[PDB]
Amino acid sequence: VPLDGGRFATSDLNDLYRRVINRNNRLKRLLDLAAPDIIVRNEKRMLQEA
Amino acid sequence: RIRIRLKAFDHRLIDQATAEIVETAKRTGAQVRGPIPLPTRKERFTVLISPHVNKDARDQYEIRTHLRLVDIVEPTEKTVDALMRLDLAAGVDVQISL
């Protein structure tokens, strides 16, 4: 829901879900053209922490 | 930018229907070339009417199909859906080539 002004005051769970989906899309891209082990280990580790 | 070529048998219908096909476009796209008529294809079938002899009594028939063009100017997504999806008048062919 927005506030008086109009800027949407967004919840915290939308930040959490949007982070997990951004990282998951990056990791899938790192499965198609993909990239070396160290890269996908950091990518999966950032998804795990997300 | 997008040729709008539409065909129908009735002239009072195809020319009525071209008034709203630009009224659904100039409301949003606000630029159309103009209603272009096209020379009509008159197909004739003159054939016998008796079930036997007297091959001198024939009845001339003719089916007139007309063609109109408006050739809309602006390819903005709003105008695209307002014509592509919004096709009206059943019994009137309309075919588009972008």
Partner: protein, 154 residues
């Protein structure tokens, strides 16, 4: 012999990290210890001394290397590096569905206002890179031209 290593930067300031890295090299004049810098990850041709490691981590807006450990960080275990390099060049000049939309072949639209609709390609134009397919709008297949990537082969 200089082997490759992976550097993590603040994602978005990557060109500025690359420029500051070249400038720190030409400041602390370990010119014989750095080969190139390739562009959120920055590739560095390098050797491993602890002095050069402190140099790269003292470059601003750099988090650290990415490897097995932080004592002796890890060079390059290429697994999909070649694929990514080839994909970049291929994308530069290459089509998605390669206009395999022949006449009478059904296709799928996922772009423009015709998104989420199927149809058939009555005519194809490999030279103009355009497929002539009509999409049943209100039942009326609205013959429209879509690119190979704009539509998918059905």
């Amino acid at each position: 012999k200089k082997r490759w290593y992976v550097v993590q930067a603040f994602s978005g300031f990557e060109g500025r990290v690359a420029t500051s890295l070249r400038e720190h090299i030409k400041l602390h004049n370990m010119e014989d210890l750095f080969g190139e810098v390739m562009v959120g990850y920055v590739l560095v041709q390098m050797v491993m001394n602890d002095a050069s490691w402190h140099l790269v981590r003292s470059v601003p807006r750099v988090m650290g290397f990415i490897g097995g450990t932080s004592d002796r960080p890890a060079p390059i275990s290429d697994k999909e590096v070649d694929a990514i390099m080839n994909r970049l060049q291929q994308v530069g000049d290459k089509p998605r569905p390669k206009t395999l939309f022949e006449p009478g072949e059904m296709v799928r639209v996922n772009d423009g206002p015709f998104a989420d609709f199927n149809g058939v390609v009555e005519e194809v134009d490999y030279e103009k890179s355009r497929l002539k397919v009509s999409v049943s709008i209100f039942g009326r297949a609205t013959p429209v031209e879509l690119d190979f990537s704009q539509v998918e082969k059905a």
